[PDB]
Design an enzyme around this catalytic site. Sequence first.
Site: not given
Ligand code: HEM
Ligand SMILES: Cc1cc(N)nc(CCc2cncc(N3CCN(C)CC3)c2)c1
Lengths: 411, 407
Positions: A108, A111, A280, A285
Amino acid sequence: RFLKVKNWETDVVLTDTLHLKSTLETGCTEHICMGSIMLPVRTKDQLFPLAKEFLDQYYSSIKRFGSKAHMDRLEEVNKEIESTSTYQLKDTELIYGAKHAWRNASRCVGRIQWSKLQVFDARDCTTAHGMFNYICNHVKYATNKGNLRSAITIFPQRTDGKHDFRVWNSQLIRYAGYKQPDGSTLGDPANVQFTEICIQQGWKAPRGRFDVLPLLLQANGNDPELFQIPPELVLEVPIRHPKFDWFKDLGLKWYGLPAVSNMLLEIGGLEFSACPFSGWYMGTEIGVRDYCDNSRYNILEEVAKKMDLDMRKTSSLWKDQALVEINIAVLYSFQSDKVTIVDHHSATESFIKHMENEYRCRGGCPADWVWIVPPMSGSITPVFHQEMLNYRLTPSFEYQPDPWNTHVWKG
Amino acid sequence: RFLKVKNWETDVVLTDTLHLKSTLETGCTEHICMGSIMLPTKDQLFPLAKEFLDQYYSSIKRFGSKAHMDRLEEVNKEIESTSTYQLKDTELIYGAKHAWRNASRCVGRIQWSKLQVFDARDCTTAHGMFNYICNHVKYATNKGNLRSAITIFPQRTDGKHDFRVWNSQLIRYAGYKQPDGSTLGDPANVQFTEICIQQGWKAPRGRFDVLPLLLQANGNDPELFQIPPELVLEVPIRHPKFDWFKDLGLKWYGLPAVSNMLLEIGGLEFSACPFSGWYMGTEIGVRDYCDNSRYNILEEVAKKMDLDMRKTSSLWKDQALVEINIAVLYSFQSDKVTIVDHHSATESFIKHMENEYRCRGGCPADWVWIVPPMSGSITPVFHQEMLNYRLTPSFEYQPDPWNTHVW
Ligand code: HEM
Ligand SMILES: Cc1cc(N)nc(CCc2cncc(N3CCN(C)CC3)c2)c1
Ligand code: HEM
Ligand SMILES: Cc1cc(N)nc(CCc2cncc(N3CCN(C)CC3)c2)c1
Ligand SMILES: C[C@H](O)[C@H](O)[C@H]1CNc2nc(N)[nH]c(=O)c2N1
Ligand SMILES: C[C@H](O)[C@H](O)[C@H]1CNc2nc(N)[nH]c(=O)c2N1
Ligand SMILES: [Zn+2]
């Protein structure tokens, strides 16, 4: 033991000690690196040291380590485990735990925001109907009319693994996909299988390009039930471009709330199998992955056509050119509509600062470079040049099997 | 123990068995992945020899032959007597090609078997080295129609007689510190340039001064040589649409030629082994031109395009980045100098991977390096799981010689 990471752009060198507190496996060995690999019912035996490890970390964080309160709590948890085979977290511990799982999430980039998380305790929930109500409230709170607020809703923990709470949707808000008999796809091709499940479960599909999927919710290990999120709670953004007036006619829109609902939250050995969380979006993405993956909406061609780029040879970089415009449009649209979004430059810059702060104050910041670097323009962002160490700390978010593959149907 | 890799774009799954012949270490452990980190006797020698000779003799359908056994015997004897051994021409060529084949950070390995090997093991002096390197440069360049090549100098003996090319690449631009506090030329080459000046180089102090070669033979002091200017093919950079682009005064060299690596074959170490292929456009237009610590031209270009540079979210950086990379590709193509765009190159590598899985049971690959520095996810490699492991023969990093040299 000390580990150093170097930024090759700035020559800044950091020292990681935090990795000494790492636990679970990476998947790598001295013989093989699995850095780019996407993917990898507990006894009291293994449970107490996990509880104790967590409670020690919690009590250190509030500067009450070794206090009578600390010691009583361990005692309390210990007995509860030997009596009941599990234990219940205090509200404070749950909140601390949820925040730290996010702090620890090595994939993430967002963070920097980890300490600002609204935690909704849904551990009193007993039915799918109750889950639906909780999730609606989460969506409404998190959306906040476009001024997005990070949130997580935590449903009851796993017990014997036969009474699992699960959100079957991978994300709270996603668009349906439909395979046509000619092999073409309508809507989001990634969601074809899940859409079929929803349809089988009784969902009446409108069969358009952007149909918000219903929630499929499982409480207490029972068969899942369908619910439609009130449309008025689903904030969406029509996509248009600041210079190209034809972009609106592409018919694109997207939902404002990114909310992951298929992951497992582990805190102190306890397993929270339904724990939807949301923040958000970072522009890429949607603009890069959702719209431009060949396996998703795949709009690069149409856009490039409308820009009249030379599409006869890849070396004109028509794809890269269209890709940029699409990402400008996504950012433009969200901003114009006052829906919180962050560009990949801002988000990576903020992550580097977060990361350095963590090294200073925490002794490390586990990070998965493969996921952290944005899917366009990688090396004009500072994370590209940043060496990272990836390791796993608890509390944490983990993948879990998809529920349709494991669920025992009651009928 | 038998590992699968998935392509998430195509759902294709491959089974890797080749990793079970991995030898060297990754830096990773069960507790920590170092995937994003850039850098890491007679008894030791014979098993390494045998390992190599075994794979050589297997490659020619002659495993367990008498020629196999006889060779093994001869080498064992030679190591016992001389403490090292000499590779047969055939073995040297096989080894070099396989070092390339095994290069996990190389996107261009589909070309691996088409490598011209120049055996420079008879070289004894720095003048000899210069001559061999000129010849390499001229052959590889081929008036713009680039051909892959490696020149291999004498192997390490006691480590006190190392051949080294002190330059990190055969062809690069000087860097100088200005009294203005700024930097002139290539900022990454300041230190090396000072060493050249220190060692007697008369620097022109321009923005694109091709560095002289600093050549070390037989562990002796390095000497200076200037590559004949006429052998260094350069490309003025223009844009097909922006007339003003030429006015930035940008050019780059056509020959990418790595000269600071160590080639290991059958336990033997070749500390001086410059190799070259042809560029992938992003190397120049993304890294060389747009890295903040390199030529860093993003702002200049952006201003010329009159983009809104007030806010990151206008993506002016990304816009200028694309055009800069368009100009690079267009310029090389216009001058007929071999170059490949990242789409073509990554597509090639996916094909190569499938070939390697199909015919060899795997392909060690470093995703962090294989995915291009721009437009990552619209190239197929982004969605391709890759396993990274170390196979020998191999190209390895080695210490910069100025920290090693007993002057
Ligand atoms: C608040 C603004 C946030 C931004 C800008 C952000 C940004 C991102 C992005 C761009 C990804 C990659 C998503 C993808 O490629 O599918 C990601 C993954 C992730 N985020 Fe964050 N995130 C945010 C909030 C959070 C919150 C609130 C949580 C948990 C409480 C979180 C936990 C995670 C986790 C566990 C992943 C990896 C999930 C996976 O392996 O599919 N994020 N985040
Ligand atoms: C907490 C959080 C923040 C953020 N900026 N992005 C995410 C991922 C959100 C999300 C929404 N819909 C679909 C996906 N997929 C896209 C396809 N991808 C393979 C898995 C994740 C991911 C989560
Ligand atoms: C012929 C076309 C070739 C192409 C298109 C190509 C492409 C590339 C690219 C883009 C990189 C990353 C370099 C960087 O980012 O600095 C690379 C690295 C590398 N290549 Fe290839 N290459 C080619 C030929 C060769 C040859 C002929 C060899 C060896 C004989 C080779 C061996 C290597 C090695 C060892 C690396 C890693 C270098 C390092 O770690 O700095 N390549 N290649
Ligand atoms: C054989 C080969 C083929 C190819 N396409 N690229 C390379 C890399 C060549 C190369 C040339 N000049 C300079 C470098 N440097 C740039 C700066 N970087 C930090 C180290 C590599 C690399 C080698
Ligand atoms: C195979 C590879 O791991 C896969 O394409 C990864 C690469 N990096 C990623 N990075 C992010 N943020 N999200 C992803 O889904 C992926 N997918
Ligand atoms: C820290 C990180 O490893 C570093 O910036 C890497 C990333 N990927 C790369 N990939 C290539 N091809 N070349 C490079 O120099 C780098 N640099
Ligand atoms: Zn690893």
